[PDB]
């Protein structure tokens, strides 16, 4: 506060989110006879397809997961219109038309989505879309018929939109009635992932005797850490 | 080798055997958990890295040898002392020592990597020989192949009488004594942190059997207790206690020594398993050895030089498969500074025994004859 | 000398 | 290296691995908090900075002007007292070099480790280091030969990027030694002993005494019955009054032997013998000439030969010739009991000639 | 706490440098009795109008910027820079020609080209938004136009008394400043 000369200034305003760290379990069953006569390493091919499923099942909870027993992604965070942004919510900007980008002028709902973050979170931010949205972004054409993004019809995917990287995360919603199909923000600060650094797999012929019953589990968790560092793009108003 | 077919098919050929179930947990609570298990490894791992080596093939002339050029700097960012302390630091911790070798040129491989034995598992194979080793970080295998002549991993084992494929790791033998020393130290850490001794209690029963004192009385009671009766500056105020009041002084009846003699006895069994003498690391107790010329000589003879002579014996056989000629690496047992009292009485016996000539006692002491 | 420019004292 | 492609993609490519969370909460409570953890680091860091160095691999013992004067601030010994003071505290020593010249860099700066983190990258060795103070990063690069940071690690058996730092191993005994010294500190500051109590029950079961009686009772207690000048006044207790003297039964030694055992298991982890810093207890070593010789052989010369070997490789990336740089283990005053029995051993071996015993001691023959 | 104090001071005086009053706080350049350019006097800042009453001209935008540039004089344009907030540089970047290609930052992948009309751009988040009569874009040479008088010292005081249950950190930087050269700052009113 702007201290006056003889005011006897009084005390001013002095300035916790928990990450429950849930558990992701895989227990594939396999007959013991099979693990001896097959030529393929069924011991290892099951360990390859779990690590693939785990990196893909927690990838979806990171976006549209609820809080219950799984990491809550940023898309379940009581989204509020920008300009009315509060601390407990993620700010979104509207595209105009109710289905897709604005019919009269698209590519404008993106440049004000960029300039809705603040020059401090834009130091390292990146768009996050699924596959069929970057296609709808690339289908954006000006009045002449040329592409706004990746000008020539050759040489697609310029790996930069408005000067910022693009992460094609295929677990976000597509373009729909009110979907937030494009998210932009600094997730290095905005979304914190808490995880245990190992994928434990342990065999046990003991649980079911004629089988092996591989057990595989990992502990991961995470929600938003900075509501000011993630903006979404609602396709409704 | 004739018995190899029935011992390999018993556990299951071609599939990984994971080994011990808690060596990955004993590193967290027995080496980074207590100081005694920490120091006992670091005293041995930094002593076996200190001893020089001898490269000999029938003339011992190889002081410019490529293996001694290899071991002097194994790989970029890990010297000779940092290689063996990381290698012995896997042998004492999980009973298994590993060395990757990368070789662009087919002889004398360029780099030696101490692969950690937490994430390594054997493949018992066909003829009782492990065909593969699987380096499992995350959920990803590697499967080195040893169906060849160079066999890219030497596997240094400690003695294990029950298992066919791993070692015993003296930390695993003292795992009950690590849990006594970790918990009796956390007994005292807890007891200092959540325990209530009062220096006394001021009983106010009142006219009834039970009565609290009024809030005007409670501020008065604290203010004559805070100002006049507490602190070091008020030790002995004669404390007029009127009717109803009473000061019942409390005590703290075990003060010192909460599991103190069962912690030091558990500290010594940690030092007994790895093999250090307790005067070396600094455990208090009875002086078994006398004056550090004995205990440091007993340290390099009971638990260092028996350990280093078989790590270098596996390096003598695994490396020699990379270069035609066979190599023999063994510790020096000369200008190692703790065997000086052994070396004095060798030179004083043969030095004073003047019945034989000078050129005959140079070969007894190990000198070049003249 | 208690005050700055505000007093003139 | 072949296993480099598999451990870095699981740890996370191109990202900063932070590691220990309590790397700075152990410094202010285990180095500025208790004197045993203070002294044991300052004993070693002042000792490893005192042993001189020699330049081998040049074919004759001679960058020695760089180490004796690294920068405008800290001196040769001030550099190693700060370098070893990070390896003993956090297990990680870092060394920035600025090189406007192509070889033999001008300044060496000990980058403190608690504000420093690695990034592994795609393969093998770390690609960069991030010096993060406030919110601001720096992102050094290791994708070249001169590699502006030497990263000295202690041994860590489970982690691939940091050291273990014996303060982390003795983290319980630091908390037992801090709190037991805070037990006695508090107990002298909040504890009521009385020398006694004058109980006034009265005619009833309870009765207070009037303020004309209480000012009288203080005056005859203050003037006549308190002090060193009044020890033993026979204290006529009237009807109803009574003097019940209180005691203070645990007087000495509140957590005294648990603190001294905690004070020695701090010295056990850093490697100092208890005679050097002053821990009371049993006489393990006898006469300090073997206690100092055990110090410079078990925990100083193993520590300095791993730092000086990492200085030997990293500095030899700047000048073309590879340099070796190891502690001298001679003209150090603690190994004199090691040295004189060597000079007495081959010195009295009169069978071999004079040119043959100068070569055993490291003397140039004439 | 020394980090969040130094951050608030660098952010609380940033707003007084632009829209502060004279009372006990630095007078920013926006509170300086703006007068239309061409009729510019010494005691006032000259502004140029954009056309439409809410935003840039509907028929031809991007001209209210180029005549904002050429309203300074070739001596103050030697080193001048635009000053806007975030959601205005976005409205400047949303400017598209008749075909639809964004006059500023040609391709979508472009970013902030950092040189509107050849001059730097300062994204100062304390300037007004695009509104009825806001001067949301200021262009001028502030090296001569705005003088900041300050002391290099935060002068934080740590106070262990008078709040003994607390510690009560105190911190007071001394800073001040208003315009020094009214000819070196031009504004852009969004009125008609």
SS3 A155: coil
Alpha-carbon D270 to chain mean position? 7
First to last CA, chain A: 40
Q: CA E2, CA D177: separation in Å to the nearest integer?
A: 32
Q: CA E151, CA D89: separation in Å to the nearest integer?
A: 39
Phi, psi dihedrals of residue D308, rounded to the nearest 5°: -70, -25
E97-128 burial, b for 16+ CB within 10 Å, e for fewer?
eeebbbebbebbbebbeeebbebebebbbbbb
Give the residue among D252, D277, D104 at the shortest CA–CA distance from D187. Answer: D252
Q: Cβ D179–B199 below 8 Å, yes or no?
A: no
What Å distances lie between residue B129 and A38, A40, B10, B91, CA to CA?
Answer: 21, 20, 13, 20
| A52–chain B nearest CA distance, Å | 9
SS3 E29: coil
Q: CA A149, CA A135: separation in Å to the nearest integer?
A: 10
- DSSP assigned state of B264: H
Q: Cβ A119–E94 below 8 Å, yes or no?
A: no
Q: Is there a contact between B320 and B105 (Cβ–Cβ < 8 Å)? A: no
Q: CA B188, CA B44: separation in Å to the nearest integer?
A: 29
E111, E117, E121, E126 alpha-carbon torsion, rounded to 10° = -110
Nearest C-alpha in E relative to A160: E109
Nearest C-alpha in B relative to A203: B18
The structure tokens listed for A207 are: 């649980």
Residue A54 buriedness (CB in 10 A; 0-12 / 13-18 / 19+)? buried
Give the residue among A202, A205, A168 at the shortest CA–CA distance from A183. Answer: A168
Q: Is there a contact between A224 and A191 (Cβ–Cβ < 8 Å)? A: yes
SS3 B92: helix
Give the residue among D43, D48, D42 at the shortest CA–CA distance from D329. Answer: D48
Nearest C-alpha in B relative to D185: B232
Residues on chain B touching A216 (C-beta within 8 angstroms): 139
Q: Is there a contact between B170 and B36 (Cβ–Cβ < 8 Å)? A: no
The H-or-E segment that residue E3 falls in is: helix E2-19
Sequential DSSP letters for E71-101: TS-TTGGGG-EEEE-HHHHHHHHT---SSS-
Does residue A37 belong to the interface with chain C, where contact is any CB pair within 8 Å?
Answer: no
- DSSP assigned state of A202: E
Give the residue among E92, E83, E94 at the shortest CA–CA distance from E124. Answer: E83
Residues on chain A touching C4 (C-beta within 8 angstroms): 5
Subunits with 3+ C-beta pairs closer than 8 A to A: B, C, E
Does residue E2 belong to the interface with chain A, where contact is any CB pair within 8 Å?
Answer: no
Q: How many CB atoms lie within 10 A of CB E3?
A: 9
Q: Is there a contact between D300 and D44 (Cβ–Cβ < 8 Å)? A: yes
Q: CA E45, CA E142: separation in Å to the nearest integer?
A: 13
Strand partners of residue B243: none
Give me the sign of the Cα torsion angle B292, B295, B300, B301. positive
Instruction: Identify which of A2, A116, A119 has the shortest CB distance to residue E25.
Output: A2
The structure tokens listed for E80 are: 């001048």
Q: CA D301, CA A210: separation in Å to the nearest integer?
A: 59
Give the residue among B227, B225, B237, B224 at the shortest CA–CA distance from D227. Answer: B237
Strand partners of residue E150: E175
- Put simply, the chain C residues between 1 and 9 with a CB less than 8 A from any chain A CB are 3-6
Q: CA D258, CA D176: separation in Å to the nearest integer?
A: 8
Please indicate whether chains C and B are in contact, defined as at least 3 beta carbon pairs under 8 Å: no
Give the residue among B249, B294, B287 at the shortest CA–CA distance from B268. Answer: B287
Residue A235 buriedness (CB in 10 A; 0-12 / 13-18 / 19+)? buried
Residues on chain D touching B235 (C-beta within 8 angstroms): 191, 193
Residues on chain A touching B138 (C-beta within 8 angstroms): 51, 198-199
| E188–chain A nearest CA distance, Å | 21
Residues on chain A touching B141 (C-beta within 8 angstroms): 44, 47
Residue of B120, B185, B251 best to disrupt the D interface, most CBs of D under 10 A: B185
Residues on chain A touching C6 (C-beta within 8 angstroms): 5-6
- Put simply, the chain D residues between 305 and 364 with a CB less than 8 A from any chain B CB are 305-306, 309-310, 313, 338, 341-342, 345-346, 348-353, 356
In sequence order, which ranges of D190-237 are alpha helices (DSSP H)? 211-225
Q: CA B51, CA B305: separation in Å to the nearest integer?
A: 9
First to last CA, chain E: 47
> Number of helices (H) and strands (E), helices first, in chain D?
13, 9
| E26–chain A nearest CA distance, Å | 10
Q: Cβ D254–B251 below 8 Å, yes or no?
A: no
Q: CA E83, CA E184: separation in Å to the nearest integer?
A: 13
Q: Is there a contact between E20 and E28 (Cβ–Cβ < 8 Å)? A: yes
List the beta strands (DSSP E) in chain D: 53-56, 92-98, 107-109, 116-119, 128-131, 149-153, 197-200, 241-244, 324-327
Does residue A8 belong to the interface with chain C, where contact is any CB pair within 8 Å?
Answer: no
At a CB cut-off of 8 Å and minimum separation 6, what does A176 contact? A99, A235
Residues on chain B touching A201 (C-beta within 8 angstroms): 139
Could you give the count of Cα atoms lying within 13 Å of B283 in the half-sphere of its Cβ?
A: 28
Q: CA D314, CA B272: separation in Å to the nearest integer?
A: 39
Residues on chain B touching A40 (C-beta within 8 angstroms): none
Residue of B139, B141, B145 best to disrupt the A interface, most CBs of A under 10 A: B139
The H-or-E segment that residue D83 falls in is: helix D76-90
- Resolution of the PDB structure in angstroms: 10.5
At a CB cut-off of 8 Å and minimum separation 6, what does A32 contact? A205, A210, A211, A212
Nearest C-alpha in E relative to A143: E99
The H-or-E segment that residue A163 falls in is: none
| B138–chain A nearest CA distance, Å | 5
Give CA angle at D8 (D5, D14), nearest 5°: 115
- Put simply, the chain E residues between 93 and 112 with a CB less than 8 A from any chain A CB are 93-94, 96, 98-102, 105, 107-112
First to last CA, chain B: 50
| E183–chain A nearest CA distance, Å | 29
Q: CA B82, CA B90: separation in Å to the nearest integer?
A: 12
Phi, psi dihedrals of residue E170, rounded to the nearest 5°: -130, 145
Q: Cβ A43–B140 below 8 Å, yes or no?
A: no
Q: How many CB atoms lie within 10 A of CB B104?
A: 6
Sequential DSSP letters for D131-159: E-BTTB------SSSS-SEEEEE---SS-
Residues on chain A touching E99 (C-beta within 8 angstroms): 142-144
The structure tokens listed for E108 are: 């979508």
Three-state helix/strand/coil letters over E124-153: CCCCCCCCCCCCCEEEECHHHHECCEECCC
In sequence order, which ranges of chain B are alpha helices (DSSP H)? 4-11, 23-30, 35-48, 66-72, 80-94, 170-173, 175-193, 215-226, 260-274, 278-281, 295-302, 305-320, 340-352, 358-365
Q: Cβ A3–E172 below 8 Å, yes or no?
A: yes
How many inter-chain contacts (A to E, CB under 8 Å) are there? 74
Q: Cβ A43–B15 below 8 Å, yes or no?
A: yes
Experimental technique used to determine this entry: cryo-EM
At a CB cut-off of 8 Å and minimum separation 6, what does B10 contact? none
The structure tokens listed for B290 are: 């006398």
- DSSP assigned state of A211: B
First to last CA, chain C: 7
Residues on chain A touching E102 (C-beta within 8 angstroms): 111, 148
- Put simply, the chain B residues between 236 and 295 with a CB less than 8 A from any chain D CB are 236-244, 246-247, 249, 251-253, 255-258, 260, 263-264, 267, 279-285, 287, 291-293
Phi, psi dihedrals of residue D79, rounded to the nearest 5°: -70, -50
The structure tokens listed for E132 are: 């009825």
């Amino acid at each position: 506060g702007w201290a006056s000369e003889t005011a006897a200034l009084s005390e001013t305003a002095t300035p916790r989110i928990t990450i429950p760290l849930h558990e992701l379990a895989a227990m594939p069953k396999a007959s013991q006879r099979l693990l001896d006569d097959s030529a393929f390493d069924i011991e290892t091919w099951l360990a390859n397809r779990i690590a693939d499923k785990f990196a893909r099942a927690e990838a979806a909870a990171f976006i549209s997961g609820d809080g219950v027993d799984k990491p809550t992604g940023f898309l379940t965070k009581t989204k509020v219109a920008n300009g009315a942004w509060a601390w407990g919510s993620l700010g979104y900007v509207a595209t105009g038309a109710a289905g897709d980008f604005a019919a009269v002028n698209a590519s404008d709902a993106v440049v004000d989505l960029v300039y809705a973050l603040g020059a401090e979170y834009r130091a390292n931010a990146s768009f996050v879309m699924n596959s069929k949205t970057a296609g709808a972004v690339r289908k954006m054409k000006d009045a002449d018929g040329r592409f706004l993004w990746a000008d020539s019809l050759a040489a697609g995917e310029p790996a930069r939109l408005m000067g910022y990287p693009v992460l094609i995360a295929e677990d976000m919603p597509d373009i729909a009635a009110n979907a937030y199909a494009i998210a932009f923000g600094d997730f290095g600060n905005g979304y914190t992932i808490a995880e245990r650094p190992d994928l434990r797999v342990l065999r046990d012929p003991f649980s079911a005797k004629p089988h092996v019953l591989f057990y595989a589990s990992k502990r991961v968790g995470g929600d938003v850490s900075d509501f000011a560092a993630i903006k979404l793009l609602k396709f409704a108003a | 080798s004739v018995t190899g077919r029935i011992v390999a098919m018993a556990s299951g050929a071609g599939r990984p055997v994971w080994g011990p179930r808690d060596t990955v947990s004993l590193m967290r609570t027995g080496f980074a958990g207590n100081p005694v298990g920490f120091r006992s490894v670091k005293l041995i791992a930094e002593a076996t890295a200190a001893v020089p080596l001898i490269c000999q093939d029938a003339e011992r002339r190889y002081e410019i040898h490529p293996v001694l050029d290899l071991l002097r700097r194994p790989n970029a960012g890990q010297g000779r002392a940092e290689l063996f302390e990381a290698l012995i630091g896997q042998i004492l911790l999980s009973g298994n020592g590993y060395l990757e070798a990368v070789c662009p040129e087919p002889g004398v491989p360029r780099e030696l990597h101490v692969l950690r034995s937490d994430r390594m598992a054997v493949v018992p194979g066909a003829d009782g020989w492990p065909v593969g080793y699987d380096y499992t970080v995350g959920g990803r295998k590697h499967r080195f192949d040893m169906t060849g002549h160079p066999d890219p991993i030497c596997h240094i084992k400690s003695f294990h009488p029950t298992d066919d494929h791993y070692g015993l790791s003296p930390m695993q033998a003292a795992a009950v004594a690590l849990d006594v020393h970790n918990a009796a130290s956390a007994w005292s850490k807890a007891l200092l942190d959540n325990a209530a001794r009062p220096s006394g209690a001021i009983i106010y029963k009142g006219a009834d059997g039970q009565g609290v004192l009024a809030p005007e009385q409670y501020e008065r009671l604290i203010f004559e207790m805070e100002t006049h009766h507490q602190g070091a500056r008020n030790a002995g105020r004669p404390m007029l206690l009127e009717g109803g009041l009473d000061w019942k002084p409390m005590g703290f009846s075990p003060s010192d020594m909460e599991f103190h003699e069962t912690k030091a006895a558990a500290a010594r069994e940690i030092a007994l398993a790895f093999g250090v003498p307790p005067m070396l690391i600094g455990i208090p107790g009875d002086a078994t050895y006398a004056n550090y010329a004995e205990a440091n000589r007993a340290f390099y003879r009971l638990t260092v030089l028996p350990l280093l002579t078989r790590v270098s014996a596996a390096l003598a056989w695994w490396l020699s498969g990379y270069l035609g000629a066979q190599i023999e690496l063994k510790p020096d047992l000369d200008q190692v500074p703790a065997l000086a009292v052994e070396r004095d009485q060798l030179w004083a016996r043969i030095g004073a025994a003047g019945f034989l000539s000078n050129s005959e006692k140079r070969v007894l002491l190990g000198l070049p004859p003249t | 000398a208690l005050n700055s420019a505000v007093a003139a004292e």
